[PDB]
Structure 1
Amino acid sequence: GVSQDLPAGLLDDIYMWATQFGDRLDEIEELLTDNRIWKLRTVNIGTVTAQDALNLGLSGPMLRGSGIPFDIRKNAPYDAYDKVDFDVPVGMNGDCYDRYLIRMAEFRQSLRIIEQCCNDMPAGAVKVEDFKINSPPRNLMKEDMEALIHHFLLYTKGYSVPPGETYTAIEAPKGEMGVYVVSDGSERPYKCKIRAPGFAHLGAFDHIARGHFLPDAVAIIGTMDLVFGEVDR
């Protein structure tokens, strides 16, 4: 779950931020979306076809810009994405300008989801209610013997994970982020490999950037949305 519950005045403050973020987005769009220089730098720059996008391992906007409607939040719903209403933007030219439009629309859809969460936040626990997995609350830890034992063990040994393996993926902001974790049944993962979307995007750079000018390369790097801690883990 999460480590602590939300503090008392947070939903109200998130709502007040949300009431003005739309204008904040409109002004950026005023500077960029119709600017002819912005279009000169982005239109037909870093084009990727749909088939090549699939073959290269691209995901997220890098894929949705080429016309393919795929998004893990809709295709394989996780935590609460099935309970909220939002739309998915899909490009058609597979270029930097289509990807920019996709990201700007995703801003709006995130604002939508944040408002729905502010309206539908339910009562109850925020972590799983088994003290063999997550630590019990502190007033139990200092009063109840089982709670103290479980707290001691969780912070010194850790919980044991049943042996096995999984590849698990989510629609991270930069594309499909996955982990492949192998458990040997102990408290420490046997193997943990991170699948970073930026890794595959930078791999596809040589195919995408060929025949462009150097400033086009700068624009393509920017459109891939690279953070290098992701790239080299």
Structure 2
Amino acid sequence: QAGERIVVNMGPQHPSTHGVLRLILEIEGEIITEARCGIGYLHTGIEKNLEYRNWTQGVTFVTRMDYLSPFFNETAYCLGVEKLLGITDDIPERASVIRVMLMELNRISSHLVALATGGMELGAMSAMFYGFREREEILRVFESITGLRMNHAYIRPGGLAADLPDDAITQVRRLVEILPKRLKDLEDLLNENYIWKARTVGVGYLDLTGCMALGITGPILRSTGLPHDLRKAQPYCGYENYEFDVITDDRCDSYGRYIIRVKEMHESVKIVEQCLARLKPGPVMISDKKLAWPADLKLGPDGLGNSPEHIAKIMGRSMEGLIHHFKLVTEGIRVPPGQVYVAVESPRGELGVHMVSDGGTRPYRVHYRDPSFTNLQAVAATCEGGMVADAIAAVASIDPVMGGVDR
């Protein structure tokens, strides 16, 4: 009875809990008996704060929600906006290809962070540094393309905030060349490592029925063997034209999820190769000037700014151009009223976005069904009955990014 069970907080401030996740564990000595989950220590009001900003501005908010998967959040938001506008069929091919390339490089980055944080949680200290060497390789490309390392606002309703810098394609080709090797270097630390496998094989087991019941998606679901990926079922942003394998496992446990992530990195590298293969020059923004983001950023001796050609156009020549720049920048497009639920295959699962427009220039509602929030329903299933050290491995395997959980 009581007297032999302690109640402890894995607490917000704990190396394995990402600082803002609270696992309340009832432990019989050191076996997890019950695992209550406390959330909202990172709640930020984004879903409400959005409502007081225009479209194409809420992007800056949504990329902050699931900060490891910024491009996925932004793509979900902008796809929702386009679906509401009915512009999904008019987006340029190049914007879609860049979107796939960036989402997949982001998948590599997010899985690298997941593996790094898990490995350091399970004592694999060098996992952090090797995963972050690989991640920095990708973050340099992100910095070049967008000018930011995280929380990019690069993907915008109807296209992108700008086109790739001339050197970007070569940077991504270099990524496609080296990521296999650096990822192999990381894998040498963990993949077959006896202590790593012992630490995650059979740990955090969750049945396919459990995944369905809790609504789990992403690597956790696919570790049950089910090849469910929103990129193949319910394609979006042109994944229909990319050849890639839905990664799945049969272990149904932490190690299965880890291997799924490691292989999803390779599948992302393959999709990135395909993206570079089918990346033809063209516009990155819808040609309908009534909605297109009017700014044309270009570098100069005085830093990144509007391209002087655009300044000349809107300040010396084009009155309609000036009005469109002014209104699309300040008020922003106004979306037709209506609702739409659009989902993407975030690295952590089915990242859904419920978007409601009241005909205005500000969103009426933007609710993120972040996969991490639902995955954290699995802490009870994957921790209860196991060892606390095994509960750490399970929680790491879920790869919860608390920004998306609390939004």
TM range (shorter): over 0.9
The list of structure 1 runs, each at least 4 consecutive aligned residues, that deviate by more than 6 angstroms after superposition, is none
Count of residues paired in the alignment: 233
- How many angstroms apart in 1 are the aligned matches of 2:366 and 2:178? 41
Query: For residue 271 of structure 2, what is the aligned residue in structure 1?
Result: 113
Matches within 5 A, 1:92-131: 92-131=250-289
Runs of 5+ in structure 1 lacking a partner?
A: none
Task: State whether structure 2 residue 339 is matched by structure 1 residue 165.
Answer: yes
Deviations along 1:127-173, one digit per CA (max 9) or x if unpaired, are 11112112335254332111111111112212111111011100011
Is the contact between residue 161 and residue 293 of structure 2 (CA under 8 Å) also seen in structure 1? no
AA at the equivalent of 1:61:
P
TM-fit CA distance, 1:103: 0.6
Alignment counterpart, residue 205 of structure 1, candidates 376, 379, 388:
379
Say yes or no: does 1:8 pair with 2:182: no
Whether the 8 Å CA contact 1:47–1:96 is kept in 2: the answer is yes
- Report if the CA contact (8 A) 1:135-1:150 is conserved: no
Identify the residue that residue 57 of structure 1 maps to in structure 2: 215
Contact 1:127 1:134 in 2 (8 A): yes
Q: How is 1:15-164 mapped onto 2 (pairs within 5 angstroms)?
A: 15-136=173-294, 137=296, 138=310, 139-142=312-315, 143-164=317-338
TM (normalized to structure 1)?
A: 0.96
Structure 2: any 5+ residue segments left out of the alignment?
1-158, 297-309
Residue in 2 that maps onto 1:179: 353
Distance 1:141 1:216 in 2: 61
State which drifts further: 133-142 or 166-175.
Answer: 133-142
Aligned-pair CA distance for 1:224:
0.7
Cα deviation digits, residues 90-145 of structure 1 (max 9, x gap): 11121011111111111111111111111220121001111211233525433211
2:232 counterpart SS class: helix
Deviation at 1:37, TM superposition (A): 0.8
Report the identity percentage: 41
Larger RCO: 1 or 2 (CA < 8 Å, sep 6+): 2
Structure-2 separation of matches of 1:194 and 1:108: 28
RMSD of the TM alignment (CA)? Answer: 1.2
CA distance in structure 1 between the aligned counterparts of 2:199 and 2:354, rounded to whole angstroms: 38
Describe the SS at the equivalent of 1:170. strand
Separation (CA, whole Å) in 2 of partners of 1:175 and 1:88: 13
Equivalent position of 2:397 in the other structure = 223
